[PDB]
Amino acid sequence: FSIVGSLPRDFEL
Amino acid sequence: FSIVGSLPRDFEL
Amino acid sequence: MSPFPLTSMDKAFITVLEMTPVLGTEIINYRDGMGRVLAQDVYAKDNLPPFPASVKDGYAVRAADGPGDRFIIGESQAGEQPTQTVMPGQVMRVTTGAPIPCGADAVVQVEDTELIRESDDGTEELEVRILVQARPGQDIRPIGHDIKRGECVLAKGTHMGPSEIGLLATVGVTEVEVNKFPVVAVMSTGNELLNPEDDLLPGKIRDSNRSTLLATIQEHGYPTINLGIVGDNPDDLLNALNEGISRADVIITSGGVSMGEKDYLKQVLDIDLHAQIHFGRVFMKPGLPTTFATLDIDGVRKIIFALPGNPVSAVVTCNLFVVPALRKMQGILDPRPTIIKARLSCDVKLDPRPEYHRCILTWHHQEPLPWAQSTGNQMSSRLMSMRSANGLLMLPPKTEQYVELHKGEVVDVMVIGRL
Amino acid sequence: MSPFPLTSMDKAFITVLEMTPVLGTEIINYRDGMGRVLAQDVYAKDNLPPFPASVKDGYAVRAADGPGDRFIIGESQAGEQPTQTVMPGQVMRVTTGAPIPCGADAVVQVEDTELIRESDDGTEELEVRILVQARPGQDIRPIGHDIKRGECVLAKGTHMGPSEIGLLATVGVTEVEVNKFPVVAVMSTGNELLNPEDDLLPGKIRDSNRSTLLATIQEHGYPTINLGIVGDNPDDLLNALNEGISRADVIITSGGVSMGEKDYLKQVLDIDLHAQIHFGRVFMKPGLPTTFATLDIDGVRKIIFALPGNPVSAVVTCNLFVVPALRKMQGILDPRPTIIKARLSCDVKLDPRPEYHRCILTWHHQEPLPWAQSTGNQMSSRLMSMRSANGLLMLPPKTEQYVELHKGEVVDVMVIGRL
Numbered sequence A, B: 001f002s003i004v005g006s007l008p009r010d011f012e013l
Numbered sequence C, D: 001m002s003p004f005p006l007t008s009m010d011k012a013f014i015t016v017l018e019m020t021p022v023l024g025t026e027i028i029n030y031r032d033g034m035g036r037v038l039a040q041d042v043y044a045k046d047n048l049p050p051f052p053a054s055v056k057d058g059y060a061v062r063a064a065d066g067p068g069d070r071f072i073i074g075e076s077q078a079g080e081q082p083t084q085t086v087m088p089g090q091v092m093r094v095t096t097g098a099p100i101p102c103g104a105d106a107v108v109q110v111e112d113t114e115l116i117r118e119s120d121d122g123t124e125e126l127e128v129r130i131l132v133q134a135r136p137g138q139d140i141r142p143i144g145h146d147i148k149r150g151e152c153v154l155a156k157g158t159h160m161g162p163s164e165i166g167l168l169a170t171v172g173v174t175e176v177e178v179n180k181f182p183v184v185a186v187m188s189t190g191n192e193l194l195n196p197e198d199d200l201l202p203g204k205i206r207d208s209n210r211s212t213l214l215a216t217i218q219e220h221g222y223p224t225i226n227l228g229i230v231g232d233n234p235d236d237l238l239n240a241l242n243e244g245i246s247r248a249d250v251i252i253t254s255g256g257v258s259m260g261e262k263d264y265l266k267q268v269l270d271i272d273l274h275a276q277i278h279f280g281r282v283f284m285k286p287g288l289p290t291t292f293a294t295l296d297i298d299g300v301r302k303i304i305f306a307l308p309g310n311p312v313s314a315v316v317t318c319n320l321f322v323v324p325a326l327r328k329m330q331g332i333l334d335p336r337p338t339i340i341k342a343r344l345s346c347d348v349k350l351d352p353r354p355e356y357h358r359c360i361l362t363w364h365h366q367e368p369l370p371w372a373q374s375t376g377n378q379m380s381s382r383l384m385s386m387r388s389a390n391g392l393l394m395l396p397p398k399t400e401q402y403v404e405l406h407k408g409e410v411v412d413v414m415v416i417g418r419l
Helices: C009-019 C161-169 C209-218 C235-248 C263-273 C311-329 D011-017 D162-171 D211-219 D235-245 D263-273 D311-329
Strands: C006-008 C023-030 C059-060 C071-077 C091-095 C108-109 C113-118 C125-129 C152-153 C175-179 C185-188 C224-230 C248-255 C277-278 C281-283 C291-297 C300-307 C340-346 C355-362 C371-372 C391-395 C410-416 D007-008 D027-030 D058-061 D069-075 D092-096 D105-107 D112-119 D123-129 D152-154 D175-179 D184-189 D224-230 D252-253 D274-279 D281-284 D291-297 D300-305 D341-344 D355-362 D371-374 D389-394 D410-414
Touching: C006 C009, C009 C277, C009 C281, C009 C291, C009 C311, C059 C071, C091 C125, C152 C161, C161 D211, C185 C209, C185 C235, C209 C224, C209 C248, C209 C263, C209 C311, C209 D162, C209 D341, C224 C235, C235 C248, C235 C263, C248 C311, C263 C291, C263 C300, C281 D123, C291 D011, C300 C311, C311 C355, C311 D162, C340 C391, C355 C410, C371 C391, C391 D211, D007 D011, D007 D092, D011 D274, D011 D291, D011 D311, D058 D069, D058 D123, D092 D123, D152 D162, D184 D211, D184 D235, D211 D224, D211 D252, D211 D311, D224 D235, D235 D252, D235 D263, D252 D311, D263 D274, D263 D291, D263 D311, D300 D311, D311 D355, D311 D389, D355 D410, D371 D389
Parallel strands: C006 C281, C071 C091, C185 C224, C185 C248, C248 C300, C340 C371, D007 D281, D069 D092, D184 D224, D184 D252, D252 D300, D341 D371
Antiparallel strands: C023 C175, C059 C091, C059 C108, C071 C125, C113 C125, C277 C291, C291 C300, C340 C410, C355 C371, C355 C391, C391 C410, D027 D175, D058 D092, D058 D105, D069 D123, D112 D123, D274 D291, D291 D300, D341 D410, D355 D371, D355 D389, D389 D410
């Protein structure tokens, strides 16, 4: 869990 | 708009 | 009249919305504006910022002086209009809220500066090297930069939350015209019902619908009236209804309105009240025997919902039909519910009718769609969650090719509570 | 001490949660249970249904009689224990709520029946053709079928909504042990602030943060205290804080805590209160100068949040840090916020720091992900919506390959209000 946003790349899986 | 559920087929587009 | 009209879900929904009035307006204190809809445009009476303000911690400077060695004539205090004029070769200390003094037209952040001299030190700076050639207007928030005087900051129809309330405080508009909230009277009918405070007696059960329904509508922040359990007879149904009509905008009842029963309540709406029953049965599962009526009384329109006595049917139909009507009543421009896409946690066997199950929406790490774990078949098969149901799984009517839905298939879900 | 510790977003969040206590318990009426967390297991004291109940409109029948021609001895009334025993060749009228009488052990719905004879007709049936051979127990809801006596219906840790409240009514458990809600005191500091009711004066602006913050926490249904505007000096900061400590669980302040300023408030927490400041700056945008402190006083732990004075920073940091702490305080097992996936409506230039923008989530017809239209850059560039912001767009810190994000790219969004 993170309250920091993820990159659209991390959405690859 | 519909308050009736759609089929997973209607999710094709 | 006689077995009343059978309607479709969609047609029933449109009917509820179309026959439901938008309530009138009243003036409230801005602090009471949560969930309210503005009935007026709100205009600014001042320029924000009202003075030119520093955007940074640093020094109010003259651009024309350039990167020289300067005398600090003082500090601009927040809350205080500055008295001194910055002259050639001088500078005034400034923090990010602070008013720009009369002689400066640029702000040099502290990072483009170095302390040269300090009056020994009893906390005081006397001279700074300004290391930069600033542009006129740099790091300054001009008067009216955020809000201009007379400009519309909130429009008619705005559904207000915390930030809007804070925007009203900012412009000093503390009283405001908004649509009224509906007052909703809830009653339960049935000769078998007892109050939750009572112990059981032969042939009796405790009334749960009244408290579930009152709770559901209180969650949207609308005022409620508890009319209690009313016996299932015309005399007592009429008196209960008359009291809700005189005290409320909306009346909700639940209890014994199926194919057998519907009788006394429809009979009193029709004959004694002369209410217009728009539908008495709707093609859905659960909640087939849901009734919707309106009463035009002394220029005013009251709306009446007779929900089924089944506890799951009553909570489903409340969310599909009542809440949307109340949202329109309090002035919301698009009173329809939010419907989202989710994946089924299980396999389900479709019914000929459109079906609705209370469910829990859960978002898992890095997945696009939430998963909808259906729980709303409650009573004899309940695998308890720590979470409340926050949606209604909207299952499609069965077709010739689609007899059942599989785990993982994308389906629709009405959001019914806070995620 | 001296310039205080700089922390990461994640580390700050964990610190807030870890240092925040769960409040004690109290007993409440079940009707006041919305949003509460059960501090006890709730057990059923009766079997539901308490009597065997018909599942359908039809006839209580003897299975052994089969599809014959029968005498209707009466009707089972809801709310009344039946007195008559169904004998061979007899049948009792029954509606779906109704108690099964002592001689029958099956229910034949009306659709598998035909009226043979009626006492002329003053509303009465005397004989029916039962067209079906029923199975023993058919269309009957046995005693205890839904809830068994002594069984746990709600567990410790359940966060209650309407249906749980209704489940409590059903089992007749009207008083219930739950965690207390936190009382939250809000104050604003700054010499430049006026009350929203006041007209502007030179160098002054109206205080908006107090009302935004009070509104945000009232929306979660927690009790609040308004401590007003406190001058930015140790004497008045101390007195304001002492009053919040004596009256509340949590104190929230906002105003002048940046790189310049932080001074008086940190100085009084540290020296006069002896509070433990856990962090004074967090690596984020907006809200870098956010402070989190705790006071252990008379066996009790109070928590203090010094939020920035910037209006957007204060509302963002309230939702990232305060709300989650309050959720844990009132007993919620997983107090973290719901974070969902959405698409950017616009292009955005990433910052070296993690950044948060207030936004509006919208679901369009038949699309998997909602679209996040950022609005939370407010003040000088606001293209007004009728909707409130219902999320925080959580932009990733800039990388070497990802300098900007494009319209349509999937990003994270914290849900901060009702969808």
